[PDB]
What we know:
homodimer, 162 residues, alpha+beta, 6 helices, 6 strands, Chromosome partition protein MukB (chains A, B), cell cycle
Amino acid sequence: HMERDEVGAHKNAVDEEIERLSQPGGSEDQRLNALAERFGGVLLSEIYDDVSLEDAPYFSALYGPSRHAIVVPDLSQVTEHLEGLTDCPEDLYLIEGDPQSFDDSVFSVDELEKAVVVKIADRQWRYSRFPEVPLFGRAARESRIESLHAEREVLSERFATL
Amino acid sequence: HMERDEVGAHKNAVDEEIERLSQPGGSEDQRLNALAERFGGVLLSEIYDDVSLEDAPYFSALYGPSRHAIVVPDLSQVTEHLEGLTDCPEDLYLIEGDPQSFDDSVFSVDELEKAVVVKIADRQWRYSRFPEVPLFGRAARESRIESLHAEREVLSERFATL
């Protein structure tokens, strides 16, 4: 029985992670996508598609609100699109870089218990706790979820077979 | 008839501003209030209670996300309150200063068509359009509304007497 039950035990653990990974959140303003396209840029959330499940929470918190940044080649030519822009979030972030070879912003940071503390300026801190559902690593989360699902099923059948 | 009608016209004008000023928004995370109290600080929101109707839009946008900041006496002394803090927004801002004689943050900014563009860092821009309902100036906005309402009523009564 110890074998059969170890399988069921492993199947429950897998389900638990699946449940964890499938919670809603790590959402983005619906308008950011079109905006990125209309600016000729790529969302930072899409660039950090593959951030590991291990790093996603820390990095999403680290970036602060700039996590929703649209990355484009040159800011100078974005101006064109900003002048008169109103149909966008009250705070829109634009970062200059290469979507294909992007360099992480550098932050003055200290870590805490599943949280981060960024020094924005002198006598100005930003406390960003780790999100349950990080904005980054969405692609990696999805693959993981599907893989875990496939394993869950193999174990469910093995278990039923006794 | 020209007198009576100018009264009506001025009345409608007042009504229209009341309408504008009364739209909901300039909202703030409901949890921020208790935390400000728990950290022994005061929300920037409250400190900038009386920002003129003229300056509120521009000023609210300028601050970016830091607009929801909790101002406290000494940052290093809040640390203890942040350790393990999870029931708060994913990004919590804390500014060290004196609520009664608070000094503004210094921003590197350029203005646009009712919007601001703050340089967060090299190759990093924040575009913040003016809010219809700014976070700051709530108190001044409230007084304006009441006064305008009181004026509205006098004009309605004058009108009815023709």
